[PDB]
Amino acid sequence: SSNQLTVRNTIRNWINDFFNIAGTIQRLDTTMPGDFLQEIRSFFEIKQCLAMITQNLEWIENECNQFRARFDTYSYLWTEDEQISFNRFLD
Amino acid sequence: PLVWTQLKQTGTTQPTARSGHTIITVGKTHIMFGGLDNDKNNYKDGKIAPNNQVFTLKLTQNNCEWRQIACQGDVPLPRCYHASCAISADKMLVFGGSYTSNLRFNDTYILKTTSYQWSKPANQISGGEPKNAESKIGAPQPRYGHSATFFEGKVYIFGGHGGINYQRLAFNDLYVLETENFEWTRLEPKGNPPDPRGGHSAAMMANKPQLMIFGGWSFTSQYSNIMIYDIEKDEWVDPEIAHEIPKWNLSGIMAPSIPSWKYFIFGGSVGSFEEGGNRTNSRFVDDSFVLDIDTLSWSSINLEADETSKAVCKPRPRESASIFYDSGESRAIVFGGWANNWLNDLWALNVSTITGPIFSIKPALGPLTGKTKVLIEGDGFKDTQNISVKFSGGKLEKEVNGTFVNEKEISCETPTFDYPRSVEVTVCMNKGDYTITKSAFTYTKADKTIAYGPGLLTENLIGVQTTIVIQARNGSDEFVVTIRNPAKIKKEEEVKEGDKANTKNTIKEDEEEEGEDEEENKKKKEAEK
Amino acid sequence: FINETDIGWMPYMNSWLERSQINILKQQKEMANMPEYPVIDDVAKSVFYRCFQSYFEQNIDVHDKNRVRHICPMVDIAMIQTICTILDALLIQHLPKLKQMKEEDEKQALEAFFIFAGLWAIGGPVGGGQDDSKDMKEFNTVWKGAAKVKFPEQGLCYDYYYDINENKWNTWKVEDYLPNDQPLFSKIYVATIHTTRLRYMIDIHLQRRKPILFIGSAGTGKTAVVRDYLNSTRPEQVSHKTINFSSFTDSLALQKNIESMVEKKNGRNYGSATNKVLICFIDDFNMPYVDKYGTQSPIQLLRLILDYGSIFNREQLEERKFLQDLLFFGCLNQKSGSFTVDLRLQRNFSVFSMYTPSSDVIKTIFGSILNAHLSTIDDKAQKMAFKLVEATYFTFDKILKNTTAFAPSAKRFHYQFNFRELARVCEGICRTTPGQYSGGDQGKLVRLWAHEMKRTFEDRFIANEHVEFFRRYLTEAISKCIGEFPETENPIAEPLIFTGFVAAHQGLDQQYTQCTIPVLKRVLDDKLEEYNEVKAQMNLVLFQQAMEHVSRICRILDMPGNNALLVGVGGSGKQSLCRLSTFINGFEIDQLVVTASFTINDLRNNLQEIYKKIAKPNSIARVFMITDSQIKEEQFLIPINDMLNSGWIFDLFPKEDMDSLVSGVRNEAKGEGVDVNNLTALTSYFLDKIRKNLKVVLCFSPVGDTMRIRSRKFPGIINNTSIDWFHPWPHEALIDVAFRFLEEIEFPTEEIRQSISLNMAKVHSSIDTANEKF
Ligand SMILES: Nc1ncnc2c1ncn2[C@@H]1O[C@H](COP(=O)(O)OP(=O)(O)O)[C@@H](O)[C@H]1O
Ligand SMILES: Nc1ncnc2c1ncn2[C@@H]1O[C@H](COP(=O)(O)OP(=O)(O)O)[C@@H](O)[C@H]1O
Ligand SMILES: [Mg+2]
Ligand SMILES: [Mg+2]
């Protein structure tokens, strides 16, 4: 989506809250206003863990797209069609 | 027509999805090697490592085949986030990488495309092997997510996210090397530096000493400002042309266009934050923006066709990707990257704005009855054979004989138009009629009047018949002869079938004579005589 | 005197392998448009030298005249040249695949590549005789003496190309006909096995600069195979223009055609600027006038253009004028004009037999046209398609197999039965509109067939014995193929008349259904009243046989493109019946008016007046009436034969007038939805409109072999037009014709007036039985 509230956009906001942990430390050398978020996102171990979460999110969506489709088949079509078209089909 | 179109990969061994991967065209062959493969088939025993696997890229009629080359001489070690560039059309090096986060390489490793053999360069990298801290011989301090621009006989690296020992930061500094010997010289500009950034792109602009460094990232705060650097006079000039939104970990490729060289940035992560704190929210943009170097300005580009979807079917953003451009087919192609997940989907697009090498026409105005030869200019214009231009357009289809004066110049005669309406000029070849913004053409008193004879200029007019001959230039015109003298001049007038006049004159006196010839109550080019 | 064995053909084979002759010519000539030859690698050379020598020197079967029955008398070198050009084109296509393969599978390919190259070089020109099918099956067994690379069984050697990636001998794959909406049937082109394996061989001789020649019976469909290829070429690579030889096409007339095609390069050179390939497709190669000695001037010119490439400019005969980047695509038919052309040209060409219609090739063309066109009409009455196409062959075969009845002879010169007839049978079935045929088609179709068959064979026939022989075959065909034999009453009958104007007149929409004679008698009589009232008055009787004649001339004008040819003894009223037939249809007859002093240039302004009326868009299709008397000299026909052969007579205008006639039909093409400002499809689309809106009805008499010598000189007259023969008036007709004229004469008891008109017929019938006795 990227709009309103969605299971991904919530899990996106969740995922974020752990990267937000970078800020709280506020660096141990050089400049005071520095972050760690950059370094944490270069670490290979975290990428793999982040990429594994996204793979599992795309699994459910496909089987949920098959689950919803079942009802959609006969049922979407009737809400699209009008009463006049129903009249034209009859006579 | 410009539109994003997915390309299906069909090979014996297709490449697995990656993030730390770089693609660089060299001669007529595009070669990709890259690491960070989701699939633990490399190292294993806990943690993900890079793969040092090379792959060739071939594409024909929108169909790609992948072909990896195991057989080399030496092998380099597995890299992730590692700037590569091309020397000449043979010698591809790669420099700098990463290995289990804490270890970072600072060793160059050449590859000869024709032999697909790697090598260690002279005695510059005697002993490689993986190590947290490497600071000797080589000037540059080990770094990942950096950038390498190639120029005539010299490679330049500006990129960041790295340091000696355990320290981690972005680089303010530019390290030069001379490929002829592989000597590492740090070059400090006299100009006031740009803020230290890592995870960007840089490339030479318009085949000039200036190279431009857009986007980037740093522990302090992300940046999003272009910064050029001419090797001549050392000090960098600052355009100070920024983007709308701050961008980082993008991927940009240079494109040749004769009128004005164009640069194309795709993917990356954007976000606007105030100094320290937060920075956590990371939006990724699919929309690739377009820069012209002669303009120095960022103009966003839109899809023309939706392919009957009735909605823009663009690829995912993919943050850290790899994009390479073909000068043959005039298209930019990006393999994939890391938009949170890993994906193996090669998406291309053909650039409408770039065309095989005017722009402008002169004259753009003409009379219908006349037959003049114009001059259409642009770029990628074929010489003699294949060259074909479109005429009229105003409720009509016309094809005019074209001749290429240059590769940026095409001569063609104006077609006889019945109605004085709106005229449009195109060009035919490629898929159908590959053109830009069409060259706009716009189609009784005659300004043309040609005269020559011994009855004009100095000649003293005697009893003898002093002759001239005009041009009719015809369907209602007037042609008034006038011979003022001291005595009574004779004056004849014979309209011939050669499309000319024959006006003699016999003045009886001789003192300083001068004959005026008017066409529609207006003097012809020549006066007096 | 050079002997053939002294010089040989080996020196060419060795010089082609080493790339010795080829290499020198490319370097040391103006010919910069030479298609670069492939690299004959050290192995690839050995494998051909080893093979060429092993399938020519060694094979006695290959050179045995009785085993390998050629059409034209191929010279040995002419065959070696065609092998070499095909081997060139195979290598260039499969060179990077060969170099990736290993020693054993590379060798077996290069061997197969020869066998296939040879197969066409030798087996291609195999054909002719009576049974082309047997002269193929005689060759099929000798070239199935093919050393290491054996054929698959259950197929001729022709039906197999060597695929590099399977290494099998796959069989040629044929693209199933998709129904287009071409109104001209001549544009319809159904791919067969034979038409794809020629399409390849034309691409193999265009990739090289090797001119091709197709040789096959008058109506085999050679022109169509090439006229498809030229249409499917790219307009930037190839530029195609046909030269249809007329007998009178002298060496001057060819040079004007070639000079019009070719532009002016730098110096004395003449090619296409931008190195295009300028195809000059000769059709009817044999036709050129054979002088007393036996040497055709235009043909000898071509042998000056192929060899040295230098046409002496007929004005200023000092200027050499060198010609460049030309190919020539011949379409010679054996059994017409100069049966064969000088072997000194046929050498330069690769010859490719086009075989007389097979039982399969007919079923894959006309099967595919009807199945497509009856998917339209009805879901039922498809299964009738193959049943009718089985029949239209069965009948077509039992005509060709009985040669003593129906064979092309001096008196039977128009009895030529080939694809042309099966095309305008399958055209006449393609006129069935869905409303007036849909439903039970068991009977209605098979009549429409019987009729369409009948009136493109009966029409042809002279002798009534031949008309009887036909109707026996036609009622055998219907007992086997259509197999119903519906009743005791045959679908075939005497009063079977089908007409598309009888429906129109009443007020019904684009029917081609059968009327009965008394319905046809009301409509025609009403339409003759309507022609007397508006045009110059022509009184004719309309008896059943003249009734039928309008019926079967209105049919030949309605079929778009198809030009009528009414043969009959002068006085038959062929001219008068045509004028009626024309007025029945919404068409406007244009007859030229010959004075005693008439010139070719004045004909060419009368023809050019007609071509200003057709070329305007909303045009009532003008008919063009010609007779035996109107053609004072044999020259006037030359323009006319080019009109009825295709579209419009080449060079009847300047190229400035034709750039304005094209422009008037740009406002029609946008309305049709055809591509505009292409200037290749627009010129083509206009030629289709001119062909459609011009009908050419010529009206000859078969007396003193003046028609036969015309048919010999102009290929157009007989083959390109749908002949309809005018027999002498039946006894039933004469009694009517007499009685109409005896009206407005007094007679005592009116019983006399009928009775006289019996004896007026009998006398005229009783002279014809004495005239035969005499
Ligand atoms: N495959 C085909 N599809 C459609 N019509 C065909 C086909 N083959 C032959 N014909 C028709 O056969 C007729 C006679 O053949 P044509 O091409 O005129 O050459 P030729 O004089 O050599 O027989 C033409 O009307 C042509 O359209
Ligand atoms: N059915 C008929 N009834 C009466 N007269 C006829 C009939 N058919 C033909 N004729 C006459 O015979 C003439 C033959 O001359 P013409 O029309 O020039 O034909 P042709 O082409 O045979 O010379 C016709 O003009 C007409 O007067
Ligand atoms: Mg033909
Ligand atoms: Mg006549």
Side-chain angles (χ1 to χ4, degrees), chain C residues 574-575 627 699:
Chain C
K574 319 158 291 187
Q575 198 188 128
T627 96
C699 286

Side-chain angles (χ1 to χ4, degrees), chain C residues 538-543 546 569-576 729 737 741:
Chain C
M538 291 304 298
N539 288 21
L540 58 96
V541 164
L542 286 170
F543 49 81
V569 76
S572 276
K574 319 158 291 187
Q575 198 188 128
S576 181
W729 295 352
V737 172
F741 283 65

Side-chain angles (χ1 to χ4, degrees), chain C residues 308-499:
Chain C
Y308 314 100
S310 58
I311 307 166
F312 285 98
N313 193 30
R314 292 298 209 276
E315 303 169 8
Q316 306 177 315
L317 289 155
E318 317 87 40
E319 186 186 21
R320 259 292 211 173
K321 185 207 181 83
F322 308 109
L323 268 291
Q324 295 193 149
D325 44 70
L326 286 167
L327 271 172
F328 303 98
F329 285 75
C331 243
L332 184 71
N333 82 294
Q334 47 167 197
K335 309 179 183 175
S336 298
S338 199
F339 304 129
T340 321
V341 303
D342 294 36
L343 264 178
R344 314 234 309 181
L345 277 146
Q346 271 178 353
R347 174 164 65 79
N348 291 290
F349 292 85
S350 185
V351 168
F352 286 108
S353 60
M354 266 284 303
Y355 309 106
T356 57
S358 187
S359 56
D360 284 29
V361 168
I362 278 170
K363 186 176 171 184
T364 54
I365 291 172
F366 302 115
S368 209
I369 296 170
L370 296 193
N371 289 315
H373 182 74
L374 306 177
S375 194
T376 62
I377 289 143
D378 200 3
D379 303 17
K380 306 178 226 172
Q382 277 194 79
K383 58 168 188 292
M384 287 280 155
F386 282 124
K387 284 185 181 62
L388 292 174
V389 172
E390 272 176 22
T392 193
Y393 181 69
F394 177 102
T395 313
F396 164 68
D397 219 9
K398 299 304 187 182
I399 294 156
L400 289 193
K401 283 173 187 161
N402 284 29
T403 53
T404 64
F406 319 87
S409 186
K411 302 192 73 168
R412 302 206 216 88
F413 58 85
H414 64 263
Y415 271 66
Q416 293 184 348
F417 307 112
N418 285 309
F419 279 102
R420 324 208 86 98
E421 74 203 329
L422 300 163
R424 70 195 55 163
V425 160
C426 192
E427 192 184 344
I429 301 161
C430 254
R431 220 188 310 185
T432 38
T433 41
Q436 53 138 15
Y437 273 100
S438 172
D441 284 296
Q442 288 189 348
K444 206 159 188 185
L445 258 288
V446 59
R447 286 165 213 180
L448 163 65
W449 175 74
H451 167 275
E452 211 65 33
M453 207 79 188
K454 201 162 282 98
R455 308 306 170 191
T456 74
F457 286 84
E458 300 300 27
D459 279 20
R460 219 157 296 262
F461 304 145
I462 302 180
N464 192 75
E465 189 175 8
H466 302 151
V467 166
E468 157 55 14
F469 260 116
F470 184 79
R471 294 169 199 278
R472 289 220 315 283
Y473 306 151
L474 208 70
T475 63
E476 276 192 317
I478 290 182
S479 82
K480 298 169 67 142
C481 319
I482 297 102
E484 205 186 319
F485 188 61
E487 290 270 300
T488 314
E489 64 92 358
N490 250 334
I492 300 151
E494 196 192 326
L496 186 68
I497 312 168
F498 272 86
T499 48

Side-chain angles (χ1 to χ4, degrees), chain A residues 41-59:
Chain A
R41 278 193 198 170
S42 56
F43 260 80
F44 309 141
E45 291 160 29
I46 294 159
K47 283 208 171 71
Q48 201 193 171
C49 197
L50 204 162
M52 194 168 181
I53 291 288
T54 52
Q55 189 171 321
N56 285 309
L57 282 169
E58 290 178 324
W59 186 94

